[PDB]
Symmetry: T
Subunit: 160 residues, 12 copies
C-alpha cells in the first residue's frame, strides 16, 4: 500500500569530514581517560580520597563517552582509531606530568584536561550538527557530563 518496493534500501552514510570530526573527539576522550587514571593512582595529600574517587567517576564517564563516539562512527560506517600511538600523536590535551602530584595540583591539571576535551567537542559541534543532528545530541550529552565533572573537581580549589 505505502510499502516501498525496493530490496536494497541504503542507510545514512557519514562523510569522511564528519568521521574525521568524531575522530578528533574520540582521541581526546581516550586521552582524558588515560590521564584520569594516572591522576587517580598518583594523587596524594589533603582530601586524597574524594579526588581519588571523583577521578574514577570522570574516567567512567569518558570511557563510556569514547565507546559511544566510536560506535556512532561505526553506525554511520566511519572507522575509529583509538590505538595508543594515534591517541598520543593526535590528542590536543596537554601532557599529564609524571610522578606523585598533590591534590591541589591534580585538581588544576585535570580541570584543564577536561576543559580541553570539552573545547574539542564544542569546536566540532556545529559542523557535526549540520550533517547529523542525532550525533550532535550525543556530543551535547558529553559536553554536559564533562562540564559537570570539571565543576565537581575544580570546586575543591575554589576560594570565596
Amino acid at each position: 500500500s505505502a510499502r516501498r518496493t525496493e530490496s536494497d534500501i541504503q542507510g545514512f552514510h557519514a562523510t569522511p569530514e564528519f568521521g574525521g570530526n568524531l575522530q578528533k573527539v574520540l582521541v581526546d576522550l581516550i586521552e582524558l581517560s588515560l590521564q584520569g587514571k594516572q591522576a587517580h593512582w598518583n594523587v596524594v595529600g589533603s582530601n586524597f580520597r574524594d579526588l581519588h574517587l571523583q577521578l574514577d567517576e570522570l574516567v567512567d564517564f569518558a570511557r563510556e563517552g569514547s565507546d559511544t563516539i566510536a560506535e556512532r562512527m561505526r553506525a554511520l560506517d566511519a572507522v575509529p582509531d583509538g590505538r595508543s600511538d594515534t591517541v598520543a600523536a593526535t590528542t590536543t590535551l596537554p601532557e599529564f606530568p609524571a610522578f606523585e602530584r598533590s591534590t591541589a595540583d591534580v585538581v588544576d591539571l585535570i580541570t584543564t584536561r577536561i576543559n580541553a576535551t570539552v573545547d574539542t567537542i564544542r569546536r566540532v559541534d556545529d559542523a557535526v550538527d549540520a550533517e547529523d543532528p542525532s550525533t550532535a545530541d550525543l556530543l551535547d550529552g558529553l559536553i554536559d557530563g564533562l562540564e559537570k565533572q570539571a565543576w565537581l573537581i575544580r570546586s575543591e580549589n575554589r576560594k570565596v
Copy 2:
C-alpha cells in the same frame, strides 16, 4: 604532537541573561515540587490513590529537574537561588490552595501549574539554545517529561 600548550584552559562561561533564564526555570520547578507534594497529601475523593501516586511521580521528576538545572548553572559558573523566600517571590505559578481538595479539582489545578512550568521553559528555550545547545537539550527533556505528566494527570477529567 598536536598537544596544546596552555597550562590553564578555561571552561565555558554563561552570560548573566543565560544564568537569569535558568534561574527562572529553577524557581518554577521547585515551586511545582512543593505544590505537587501539597496536592499529594491533601487530595481526597474519587480515584484518590491513582492521583496520590501519580503526583509523587511528578514531584520526583521536578526535583531531579531542579537539581539538573541548578547544577548546570554551577557548571557554567552561574549561581542558583532555590531558597523559599526567593521561590515564593519569583515563581510564575498560580498559588496552590490550602486544605483538602477533590481529585477533580486537584487534576485541574496541577495540570494548570505543570503547564505554567512548561511555558516558562519553552519561553527561555530559544535564547538558551542560541548560547548553549547542550543546556537546551536538558530543557527539552524537562518539557518532554512534564508534558507527559500533564497528560497522565489531566486524562482523569477528560470528557469523551
Copy 3:
C-alpha cells in the same frame, strides 16, 4: 513581591495536524519493524543463528520502547496515535518481510534494509518536527541513534574484509 500568574486555566502545547501526521508515520514504521523483527527472530536459521536470534530481540525491544514513546508524545501534545494492525499494514513504508524460514545471511540483509527504511522515515520528518517542537525532535534523534546502532550490530555479519 509576587510574580505569580493569575489564570486558573493555563493551556498546554497543542500539535498541528501536520505534526501529528508526521509522528503517526514514525509510529507505524516502528511497530512494523517490531513485528518484522520478531518474525526474523523466530524464523532465522543457519550459520551464526544464535547471535542474530538474540540481537533481533534487542532490536524489537528498542523499537517497542520507541513506538510507546512516540505514541505517548502524541498524546501529550493532544494528537491521537493509531497503532492498529490494519493501519500499520496499510500505511507502513517498510517492504514486507518474506514468509517462512530465511537464512542468517538473508535475514541480516532484509532486517538491515527495514531498519534503514524506518530511520529514513524519521530523518524525513525530523526537520519539520524540530521546527514546531525541538523536544520531540530530540526523541526522534534518540531513535535514529539507537536504530542505526542496531543496523550496524546486525549488518556487520555480512560485511567482508
Copy 4:
C-alpha cells in the same frame, strides 16, 4: 549398556494441522497486544491511570505469550507468521475502534477482545492436547493469565 546405538535420533515433529492450530493462537495474541497498546494510549476519563497501567500489564502478558507460542512452533519445526498483513487478515478479534475512548468503553471493548483470544485457545486446546500435552499445558497457562486480566479489567464496570 542401555545406550541407544544410533547417531541420528529424530525429535518430535508437529503435524501441519498442529502448526496451524498454534498459528491461530499466535495471530490473536499479537492482535490483542496491538489492540492493548492502542487502548493504553487512547483511554481517557474516570480512573484513567489504573486502566492505562493494567493495559500495559495485559500487553506484557500477551507479548510473552506470543513469543512462547511462536517459539513452541519452532521447537516442533512448525513456522509461525506474525507479520502485520497476516495478523490483520486472519485474527478473529473484533477491530478496536479509532480515537480516544472513555475508560468505561475501553473496559468493555478490551474484555471482549481478551475473551475472543481465550476462546481461540479453548477452541484448539483438545486437538493440541491430543497430539502434544506439553503444548496444551502452555495454552492452559495462557488461558489462566488472560482470564485473570479479563477479571482485573472488567471489574471496573461491574455493578453490585
Copy 5:
C-alpha cells in the same frame, strides 16, 4: 477478514459444583496457612531453627496458593469465602493444638495436616480437570509444592 462480529463476547463461567470444589481447596489452604504460622511460633526443642524456618516456607506457599485459587474463582465468576468463621466451620484439617510443641510432634502434626490439604485437592482434581483443564494445572502445582513441603518436613522424623 476473519474478524468476529460480536460486540460483547462473554468469558468462561464455572458451574456451582466447580465453584464449590475450589472453595473446598481454598478453606484448607487458608487453614494450613494459619496452622503453619501457629507451628512456626510455638515449636520448641531439638532442631528448632530448621523447622521454624521451613514452616515459614510452607506458609508462604500456602498463602500464594490460596490467593491463586480465590482469584481463579473470581476469573471464572465464582465467589470465594475465606473468612475466619467459614474456614473454622468448613476446613477438613484436624485441629492444630495450642501451646508449645516439641519439634518431633510438630513434624508429625504438620505432615498430617499437609497431607489432609493435598487429599482435598486430589479429591476434586478429576472433576475440576473435566470442566476446566487450566484450573486443574493450578491444582497440580499445589499438589507438587505441598507434597514437596511434606517431604522436607517429615524427613526429620524418619527412622533409617
Copy 6:
C-alpha cells in the same frame, strides 16, 4: 574479669499473664484484619476496582507482618500466641465482613471501620503494655502508625469535599 558477672544461669525478661493476654488481643484482631482484607481484595467490584484491589493487598501485607511481629514478641517474652482460626473467630472484636461481591464504595467503608477497630484494640492496650515493657509498646506504636496510614489511604476514596 573485673566487672564480669559470675552467674551460670541468667534468665530473660518474662511477660506477665496480663501482658500476654493484652498481646493476644492485638494478635487475633491483626489476623482477622488480614483475613478480611484478603476477602475484600478478591470480592471488591466496581468504580476504581484496581486501586482498592492493590491497596487491600498492601494492608494485608502490613497486618501479616504485624501479627508475626506480635506473636514472636510474645514468644521472646515466654508468652504463647494462639492464631488458630477457631480462636480468631471466637475472640476477634472486628465486625464480621459480609459475604459475596461488594462495591468499591462499600468495601472502603467496611475496611476503614475494621482497620479502626483493630487500631482501637492496640490503643486500648498500649498504656498497660508500655507500663510493663516500653520496647513492646514501641512495636505497638509502629502498628498504630502503619494501620492508621492504611485507613487514610483507603477511606480517602469515599471522601466528598
Copy 7:
C-alpha cells in the same frame, strides 16, 4: 461472632488542633531545611567540597522523607498539612541561608546551626505530642536521631582538637 463489635461506623483517632499545629511547626522547618540543604549542596565551594556536597544530599534525603512522614501522619489523624513555599517562608524558625557561593567551612557552621534549629523545634514539641499520641512522638524521635546524626557528620569537619 462471640466478641465481635456490631458497630457499622467506627471512627479513627482524631488529632486535636494543638497537635495539628505542633506537627505543622515540625513540617515547615523540615521543608525549609530541605530547601536550604539543596542551596548549600549546589553553592558550596572550597576545601573538601565533595564530602560536603555529598553529605548535604544525604541530609536533604532524610529531611524530605521526614516532611512526607509528618505530613502524612497529619493526614492519617485528620489534620491538614501546609507545605507551600509562602507558608514555609513566612513561618519557618530557621535562620535564612545566605545567597551566593559559600566556603565549605562557612557551610558547615551554617548548616549545623540550621539542623540544630530544626531539631529544637521537634524537641520543644515532643512532650505535648507524646502526651496525646505516643506513636507520633516515636516518629518525631526518629527524626531527632537522624538529624542529630547529620549534624555530627557535618560539624565534625570544622572541629579543632
Copy 8:
C-alpha cells in the same frame, strides 16, 4: 458446625514401583545429558564457537534443574532416586558423547541427538506417569517444553535455507 477430620496419622501419596522406575529412567538421562552438555561446552571448537559454548551452559542449567526436580518428586512420593555415576553410565539410553575436541557443526548434531533421546525417554513414560499422577506429568511436560526449546536453539546453527 465442624467438618474437621479426626485421624492423627494421615498418609501421603505413595508411588508404585513402576512409577518410581519410570522417573528413574528420566533422571539418569537428564544427568547424562548434563554431563555430555558440559563435555561439549568445554570441547567444542570452530566456526561460531562462542554461541554454542554459551548455549550449552544454558542447556546444562536446565537439565540440572530438571534432574533435581525429578529426583525430589521421587522423594516426595516415597521413591528413591539413583543418580550415581556408575548407575547413570550403566542405564542411560543416550548414545555416548565422543571424546576430545569436536567441531561446532558436529557438536550441534551430536547434542541435538542427545536432547532428542532425553525427550524421547520422557515422552515414552508420560502416559503411564500421567495415569497415576497428573501433577508429575506436568513436571515432565515442563521438561519436554524446555528441552525441545534448547534443541531448536542449538540445532538451527546447522539448518540450511
Copy 9:
C-alpha cells in the same frame, strides 16, 4: 523572615556525663557479645551445628549494628565512646566465654545467658536514658527487642516439652 530565629550559633542537644556513662555500659556489653558470638560461631560442634553456626552470625550482625548505633548516638550527643579491647575486657558485665570447642547444647545455654546479661544492662539503664532523651531510649528499645528475639531463637533448641 517573619518567624526566623536570628541566632548565628545554635548549639545541639548535649548529653550529660551520666547519660554518656550509661551508653558506654551498653556499648561494651554489645561489643563483648559480638566477640563472644563469633567465638561460639567458630568453635561450636555437635548435634544441629549448622543451625547454631548460622544463628550465631545473625546475633553478631545485630550486636555489631547495635554497637555502631549506640557509639554514633554518643558522638551525636557530644559523648565519646570507648570500644577498645582492654576497656571492653575490663568493664563488660558478661560472664567470660570459655575456650576450646563446645557442644551445641552448651553453646545454646552459654550464649542465651550472655544475651540476657546484655539485655539486663540495657533494661537497667533505660529509665534514666528515657528521662533525659526519649529518642535514645527508642534505640535502646530496638536493641532489647532484637536481642530478646535472638535469645528465643537460640534457647528454643534446648527446650524440653
Copy 10:
C-alpha cells in the same frame, strides 16, 4: 619501540603430564558433585534440613570447581573428559551407597568423599605448581573451599 616484531606469538602450552594431573582433579570434583546430589536427595533423620541444604552448597562449590579446572585445561590447550563412563572408571572416591541414609551416616560418608577429593588435589599440587603457579593457585582455592565444606559437614557428628 619496545614492540615485538612477530605476528604469531605462542601462548603457554600445558604438557600432557600436566593435563593428566588436572584430569585427575576433574573426575573427582565431578564424582563429588554427583555423590553430593545423591546424599542431598536421600538423606533422612535428625537435622535433615541443615544437611540437605549444606549438601547443595557443597555441590555448588564442586560444580564451579570442575568447570574452573576443565576450562583451565582448555585455556592451556589440554582436553578434559567429564563423561559419566570416564568419571565412574577413573574416580578415586569410594562409591556412595544406594538408598536412604541417616543424617549421621551421610555426614561421615560425605566427609570422607570430600577428604578423598582434597587428597587428589594435594597429591598433584607440587607437580602442577612446578609447571604453572597460576593453576596451583586455583587448586589451592579448591583445597580451601572443600576443606571448609568438610568442617561444616563433619561438625554435626563431633562429640566434645
Copy 11:
C-alpha cells in the same frame, strides 16, 4: 575401577606451631577491627567524612579476614581464640588512644596499626606456606587488602 577402599579418609591436620601462627594473625586482625571502629567514631577535623568512611571499609575487610582465618583454623582442626581478654593480652598492635583525635593524627595512628598487622602476617607467611600453601594464599590476600587500605588512608598526610 580406581575407587579407593577406605571407609574413613581423614583430612589435613595443622601442627601446633601452624595453629599458633594463625592465632597470632587472628588477634591482630580482631584488634585492628576494634581500633578501626574506635577511630571511625572518634575522628574529627579536616576531611572527617572521607576518613570516617574509609575506616569502615578497613573494618569490614579486617572482620572478613578474621572470620576467614578463624574458620581456616577450624577446617584444619585448630582452635581459634578471639575473646576480648585474649586479644588485649596478646595483640602486637600499639594501643589506640581514647577520646577525639584529629584526622591527621588518626591517619598516622591507623597507618601504623595496619602496618603492624601486616608485619605479623608477613612474619608467619613463610612457615605457613611451607606447611600449607592454600593457607598462605589466604594470608597473601590479607596482605594485599590491608596494604591497599594503608595506602588509601596514609595518602591524606603525604607531603608532595
Copy 12:
C-alpha cells in the same frame, strides 16, 4: 600481660626499584591490550561478528581491572605507575594493532597473539616478583589465569576439527 609493640611509627613494605619496573612492564602491556581490545571491538566485521564484538568487551573489562589492580599495588608498595599514552606506546611489547576494519578471522588471530604477548610479559616477571613479594605474584597469577581464559574463548573460533 601485654605483647603490644611500642613504636609510634611502623613502616610498610617498600618495593625495590627492580620490582617497580617489573610491575610497570605489566601495566603498560595491560593498558595497550585494553586499547587494542576496544579497537578490535569497534572494527571487527564478518562471519560471527557479534560473538567476537561481545567477547572483546569482556577482555577489555578484565584488562582494565587488571591494570588498575597492578597500578594500585604499585602505589601500596611505594612505587609510582606510568599509564600515560606516550609511555604506553613507547614501552609496550605488544605488536601494534593494525588500522581500519579487520575480518573476524584476522581479529581472532591478532588479539590472541596480543593476549599471548601480554601473558608472556607477566610470566617473565613472575619469578622475580614472587621472590620479593608472594602477595603480588598471586595478583599476577590471577591475571595470567583470566587472560589465558580470554585467549581460549577468542581463539577457538579459528580452531578446526
